[PDB]
Amino acid sequence: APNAKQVRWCAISDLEQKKCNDLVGSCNVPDITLVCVLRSSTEDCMTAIKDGQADAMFLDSGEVYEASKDPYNLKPIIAEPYSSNRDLQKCLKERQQALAKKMIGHYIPQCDEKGNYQPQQCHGSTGHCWCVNAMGEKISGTNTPPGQTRATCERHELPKCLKERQVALGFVPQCDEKGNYEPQQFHGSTGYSWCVNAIGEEIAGTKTPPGKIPATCQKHDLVTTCHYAVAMVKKSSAFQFNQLKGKRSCHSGVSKTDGWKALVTVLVEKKLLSWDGPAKSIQRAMSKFFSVSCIPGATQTNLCKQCKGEEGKNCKNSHDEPYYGNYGAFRCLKEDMGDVAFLRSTALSDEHSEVYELLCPDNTRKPLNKYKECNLGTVPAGTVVTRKISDKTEDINNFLMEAQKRQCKLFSSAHGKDLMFDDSTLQLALLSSEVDAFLYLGVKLFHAMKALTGDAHLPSKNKVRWCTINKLEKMKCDDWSAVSGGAIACTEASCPKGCVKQILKGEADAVKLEVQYMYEALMCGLLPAVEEYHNKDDFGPCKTPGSPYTDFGTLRAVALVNKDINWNNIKGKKSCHTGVGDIAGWVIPVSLIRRQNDNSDIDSFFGSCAPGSDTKSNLCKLCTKCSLSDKEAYYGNQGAFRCLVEKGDVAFVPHTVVFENTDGKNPAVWAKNLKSEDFELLCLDGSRAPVSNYKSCKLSGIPPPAIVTREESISDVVRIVANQQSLYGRKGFEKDMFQLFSSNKGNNLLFNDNTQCLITFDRQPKDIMEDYFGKPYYTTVYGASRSAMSSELISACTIKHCSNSLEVLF
């Protein structure tokens, strides 16, 4: 026992502890010992993990929000991945995953030299073969046994969007770099803009003429194998959905979506459940809605009267209650202890079609196989949770991954169904450490959960909650709030993206974002209310807002070089950059190069000092060394210009850099004998220009910093910002009380200190991505696509659209 680790799994029932103790014996994972801690309910297992008495458990997706709060403070870490229409390199990953399993004779996907699925797939140990599309999905009916004539497989790899950009050039849709439909479509000849499904089908009520502001189009992902909450009834009964009041019911549990929450949402929407807002209880109204029921975990007696558990176990969130869970709820319906069962579609099977049918919110009934048309909503997968502090996440993940490779019986047991995990689970994958309850559920589901538990917040129309990113920003905001007359409040986040999440969560209202964060924020539906105006010379727009402007103060990214050089002979040259993350030094030039060649600039291109790269890549030679820090003398605008003068003659820098050190402003030894005439810049033609021609001899201009907010909060934010700006800041009536654009607490806190003022963003009848970024920046950096970058935040702002398979795209 040197590096011997313990993973304590919390079991809520005797049946779960039996299955868990089976895995302690039958499952040998090297260096990780499994321990089974027994509690009496779901809630007590959550408390045990919060107390450090257990490490992990599986929770229904409807329990994730409440688990993230006191008195539990748990966080999802491991969950079943879904098959998406945006999975890349799927055959290669599935082949690697299948080869990692410690078993002989299992199906291992076969890929070609490019990593595509081979159109024919075979299970080697059995001799069966079948056909397959680009996503590895079996073409229906093509499975043949050994010794039978095989189905001839075609390549089924052309996506739907690209096969309709050809039946046009022989309305032309806009497609991904991977052939997926873009969420926003623009008709090139009629000027219309509308929003499209994940299959490219038009969303109702989104078309706009050229003179109108386009609709707000959310990203979509086509996903397969969705489970649903359904109302299951016997065919011998006669009541419809709007006659549930007074009936006997049975639910999987009070905290699950398949047994609660989904039903409560539908009852409220259909106006069948009479109940005032939360804090005025949902259980009280439900206890008056149903006559007598079994709802495990319920605190009203009549909602527990139909439960069958023995004393001490009756109505518990535990398999010790025989009617708990999806199969327990069906059992209660079967034994006629209730008139209707609320459970997940996974509990349905064709053997129940003789006696059972589905109660639809349509006030109609349908067979079980119509559950995709007769349901109370989708139910996302459950997840393994642990403490937010994530002290044991590594050990928990290592055990489950190793247990899955070694074919341990994780997702089945002779003792019962849905023990420890959902039996329907096929695999468990580790989630990003960034993932919390908000990211896992997504923005829409999170707010539905937030509203159901009574934590919903309706912000003031007259107060703006400003999000800060550090203690210095919090102090300046506090100074701002103290003089704002109740118009400004302050919240705290760790970083700009944390502020973006708070705004989406309804915990904050506004934050200033640099350009690097605007792509994710605009993806999630946020909009810029006001922008930083930086024209130090012209002040007209700042004293009468709404008056036109000539230059917004935008920085312009230039290539600066006394020698011969043009944009076309840049390859194999001594070029430096301010940093790998900086926008002018790295983002825009690399985007130009990687579009005029095929994506190899990690110095298989150039010669080049670009800090923040591999220790001795070809980069860090012209640059202890090559650090994203002041300790590298070639970092920043001042840096990488010391390169331009000393080590090589080409620099990727903003237009301001030369004026900062030309004509003698930066002593040292080198930096005050150069002239503004000694350095000139390279245009995109290949010509040269004087360094003040940066407004024409430019690679690109970078958009200004924007204060973002929700769409519904826009009008109130600009009006409060405008009112507050007239009072405080540059040339304000009471600016001796407070300053917006400077502070004794620090520099560049809430806004950049060199900001002249804040100008209200005026939305043009164009795509919001091009409206803020500008088409030169949008096309060069993101390819004018909504799929150029992916993150956990963008995924949480993506609508999951279900489908029986992905074959609709081929």
Side-chain angles (χ1 to χ4, degrees):
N3 310 32
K5 311 292 244 305
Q6 272 193 13
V7 170
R8 289 161 316 172
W9 208 276
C10 195
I12 68 182
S13 62
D14 287 324
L15 294 181
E16 261 191 6
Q17 199 195 13
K18 281 169 188 182
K19 173 178 180 178
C20 183
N21 279 332
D22 284 351
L23 289 167
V24 172
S26 71
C27 193
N28 181 256
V29 175
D31 297 337
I32 300 166
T33 308
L34 178 67
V35 186
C36 306
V37 185
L38 174 71
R39 290 302 181 265
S40 66
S41 56
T42 305
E43 324 95 54
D44 288 353
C45 265
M46 295 187 306
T47 295
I49 293 165
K50 186 267 303 190
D51 290 333
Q53 301 267 299
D55 301 310
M57 74 186 288
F58 193 79
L59 285 183
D60 184 285
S61 79
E63 309 171 320
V64 167
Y65 174 80
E66 286 142 326
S68 67
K69 295 176 60 206
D70 289 303
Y72 307 117
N73 296 286
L74 307 187
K75 154 205 184 70
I77 51 155
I78 297 153
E80 182 180 27
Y82 56 91
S83 305
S84 172
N85 127 258
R86 309 196 126 93
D87 299 338
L88 326 95
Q89 285 303 316
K90 182 171 170 183
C91 187
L92 241 54
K93 295 166 183 198
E94 298 262 21
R95 176 178 182 80
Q96 201 188 307
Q97 183 176 342
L99 282 164
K101 306 189 180 171
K102 294 327 171 177
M103 80 180 327
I104 254 82
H106 61 287
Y107 164 59
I108 296 159
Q110 298 103 48
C111 321
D112 56 13
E113 184 186 25
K114 287 181 181 178
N116 311 313
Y117 282 93
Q118 292 174 221
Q120 184 172 259
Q121 298 287 315
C122 298
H123 187 173
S125 78
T126 68
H128 284 62
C129 302
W130 60 92
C131 300
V132 123
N133 60 28
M135 296 311 291
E137 297 179 322
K138 178 172 78 355
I139 302 301
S140 189
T142 61
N143 173 35
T144 56
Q148 209 179 96
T149 296
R150 308 248 176 249
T152 287
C153 305
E154 305 180 290
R155 300 199 68 92
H156 240 37
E157 9 164 55
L158 188 63
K160 183 182 185 301
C161 193
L162 270 169
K163 65 202 303 177
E164 262 137 280
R165 273 257 288 192
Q166 299 186 7
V167 67
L169 281 69
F171 165 58
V172 286
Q174 283 119 358
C175 312
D176 221 338
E177 193 201 334
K178 304 290 180 169
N180 291 328
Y181 287 91
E182 301 274 2
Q184 178 80 72
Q185 296 293 340
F186 177 56
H187 205 337
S189 70
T190 76
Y192 278 68
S193 292
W194 68 91
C195 306
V196 293
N197 205 204
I199 69 177
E201 112 194 286
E202 165 177 305
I203 304 287
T206 59
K207 303 205 293 185
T208 58
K212 236 75 206 5
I213 306 293
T216 305
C217 299
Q218 297 156 108
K219 184 151 163 284
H220 287 60
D221 290 358
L222 191 71
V223 304
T224 67
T225 315
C226 290
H227 305 302
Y228 297 85
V230 298
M232 186 173 185
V233 81
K234 288 183 172 171
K235 293 206 208 80
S236 78
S237 71
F239 59 93
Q240 297 301 324
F241 197 89
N242 52 10
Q243 310 175 306
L244 284 164
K245 175 171 286 189
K247 298 287 178 308
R248 298 149 63 249
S249 68
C250 261
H251 309 236
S252 47
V254 185
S255 53
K256 306 151 181 302
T257 305
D258 27 327
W260 189 273
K261 308 209 162 166
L263 172 61
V264 168
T265 294
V266 173
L267 292 175
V268 169
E269 194 251 332
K270 274 67 176 63
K271 277 152 200 170
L272 305 171
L273 178 64
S274 69
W275 179 54
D276 327 305
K280 291 142 147 179
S281 159
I282 185 57
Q283 282 201 37
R284 291 164 196 164
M286 290 292 282
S287 176
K288 294 176 282 202
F289 184 80
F290 290 112
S291 68
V292 69
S293 288
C294 175
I295 317 187
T299 61
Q300 300 285 357
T301 64
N302 68 316
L303 301 177
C304 289
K305 221 283 182 181
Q306 300 301 94
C307 293
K308 204 177 86 175
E310 303 287 354
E311 63 169 353
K313 320 199 176 300
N314 194 268
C315 207
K316 294 293 268 282
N317 287 320
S318 177
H319 309 93
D320 302 350
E321 164 57 61
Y323 290 166
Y324 166 84
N326 295 295
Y327 301 90
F330 164 78
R331 179 169 175 186
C332 157
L333 175 62
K334 189 185 190 272
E335 306 181 347
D336 289 328
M337 289 306 279
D339 305 316
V340 58
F342 300 101
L343 35 64
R344 206 177 306 179
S345 58
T346 63
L348 309 166
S349 71
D350 275 318
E351 77 212 358
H352 300 138
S353 277
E354 189 65 30
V355 177
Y356 299 95
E357 61 188 356
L358 289 186
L359 191 68
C360 322
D362 244 1
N363 305 311
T364 67
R365 291 185 178 208
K366 280 165 183 158
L368 304 183
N369 58 81
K370 284 310 175 73
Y371 69 82
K372 307 180 187 189
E373 290 184 70
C374 183
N375 62 79
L376 313 173
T378 60
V379 179
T383 174
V384 178
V385 299
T386 189
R387 297 168 224 92
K388 275 194 227 173
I389 196 72
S390 276
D391 54 308
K392 278 276 185 70
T393 299
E394 192 194 17
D395 299 336
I396 296 166
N397 177 69
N398 283 335
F399 180 83
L400 283 1
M401 296 313 195
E402 280 298 317
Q404 284 174 112
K405 294 183 184 181
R406 304 166 172 258
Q407 309 307 123
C408 295
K409 290 296 173 296
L410 254 26
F411 311 132
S412 52
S413 190
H415 299 287
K417 246 165 185 306
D418 292 349
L419 300 176
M420 285 182 74
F421 311 93
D422 284 331
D423 278 21
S424 63
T425 308
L426 302 172
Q427 44 162 338
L428 290 180
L430 181 271
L431 305 171
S432 177
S433 55
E434 173 187 10
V435 169
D436 56 6
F438 163 72
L439 285 180
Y440 185 79
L441 299 167
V443 177
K444 175 138 163 176
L445 225 201
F446 176 81
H447 278 289
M449 299 292 300
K450 189 184 187 166
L452 253 198
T453 76
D455 301 346
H457 178 90
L458 190 49
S460 188
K461 296 178 65 78
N462 317 292
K463 192 165 61 70
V464 171
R465 295 172 298 179
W466 209 276
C467 183
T468 62
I469 66 178
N470 58 70
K471 282 313 183 171
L472 302 182
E473 282 202 359
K474 161 76 181 178
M475 291 190 312
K476 178 181 190 195
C477 184
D478 286 349
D479 301 334
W480 188 10
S481 190
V483 83
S484 72
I488 299 297
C490 307
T491 69
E492 292 186 80
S494 51
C495 59
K497 179 132 89 171
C499 282
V500 179
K501 291 167 188 192
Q502 287 195 8
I503 296 173
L504 291 167
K505 287 155 106 191
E507 296 170 349
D509 298 310
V511 69
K512 175 218 66 177
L513 294 179
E514 225 66 41
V515 188
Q516 322 93 32
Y517 307 95
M518 290 293 304
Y519 185 84
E520 304 194 42
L522 297 166
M523 276 307 280
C524 280
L526 300 187
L527 297 161
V530 286
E531 301 184 295
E532 276 186 6
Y533 177 83
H534 282 264
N535 192 345
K536 189 192 72 180
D537 303 325
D538 189 9
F539 195 76
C542 287
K543 55 213 316 165
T544 310
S547 65
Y549 60 96
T550 51
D551 188 11
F552 212 83
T554 5
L555 275 70
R556 305 205 152 68
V558 306
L560 195 70
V561 292
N562 195 111
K563 227 212 82 174
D564 65 299
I565 254 188
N566 65 18
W567 190 244
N568 303 36
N569 68 0
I570 225 65
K571 184 158 67 177
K573 265 66 196 182
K574 6 177 189 74
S575 77
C576 312
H577 308 256
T578 158
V580 60
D582 292 61
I583 175 166
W586 186 270
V587 178
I588 65 96
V590 174
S591 297
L592 263 349
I593 275 70
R594 78 177 165 197
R595 134 141 292 102
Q596 310 180 331
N597 101 293
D598 314 9
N599 293 91
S600 190
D601 65 305
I602 173 57
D603 263 1
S604 52
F605 188 98
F606 282 150
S608 293
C609 185
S613 306
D614 180 45
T615 76
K616 198 165 61 63
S617 273
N618 290 4
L619 294 152
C620 305
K621 310 170 80 80
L622 296 166
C623 285
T624 323
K625 310 173 175 183
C626 213
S627 186
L628 243 33
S629 157
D630 62 308
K631 317 268 225 52
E632 166 60 74
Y634 295 99
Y635 173 91
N637 295 33
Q638 42 269 343
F641 188 67
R642 196 259 187 86
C643 135
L644 194 285
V645 300
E646 307 191 348
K647 305 183 61 70
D649 260 23
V650 42
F652 285 114
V653 276
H655 71 257
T656 182
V657 62
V658 59
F659 301 88
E660 300 184 324
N661 315 33
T662 201
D663 300 12
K665 284 102 169 185
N666 192 20
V669 288
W670 56 278
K672 64 185 296 290
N673 300 282
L674 33 274
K675 308 276 197 173
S676 164
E677 298 179 7
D678 304 331
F679 304 110
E680 313 286 284
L681 74 177
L682 307 323
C683 320
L684 289 184
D685 276 2
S687 44
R688 296 167 67 108
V691 82
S692 47
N693 290 43
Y694 58 79
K695 298 184 185 185
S696 41
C697 202
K698 67 180 183 285
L699 309 299
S700 184
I702 62 108
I707 283 74
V708 300
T709 185
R710 298 170 301 267
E711 179 184 309
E712 58 171 350
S713 290
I714 292 182
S715 59
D716 293 314
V717 167
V718 6
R719 82 166 185 87
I720 287 180
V721 164
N723 295 346
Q724 204 79 194
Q725 182 157 244
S726 68
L727 299 178
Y728 309 113
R730 203 139 296 172
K731 268 119 179 180
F733 309 116
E734 268 70 331
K735 78 174 171 294
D736 45 329
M737 306 290 299
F738 179 80
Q739 288 266 80
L740 290 175
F741 309 128
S742 64
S743 177
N744 64 86
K745 309 294 188 306
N747 300 309
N748 306 293
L749 299 181
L750 277 334
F751 314 95
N752 295 312
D753 283 4
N754 53 350
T755 308
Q756 295 298 281
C757 70
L758 296 172
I759 301 194
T760 294
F761 187 84
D762 282 317
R763 265 286 277 159
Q764 305 299 297
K766 324 166 55 182
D767 186 24
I768 176 65
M769 303 289 312
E770 178 182 346
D771 195 356
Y772 166 74
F773 282 119
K775 182 171 276 177
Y777 191 100
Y778 189 27
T779 49
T780 293
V781 180
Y782 299 105
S785 86
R786 306 273 179 83
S787 301
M789 173 173 63
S790 277
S791 62
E792 302 285 5
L793 183 49
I794 298 177
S795 181
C797 303
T798 302
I799 277 75
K800 309 309 172 306
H801 162 23
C802 301
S803 183
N804 324 269
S805 70
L806 304 170
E807 278 169 55
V808 206
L809 299 191
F810 301 107

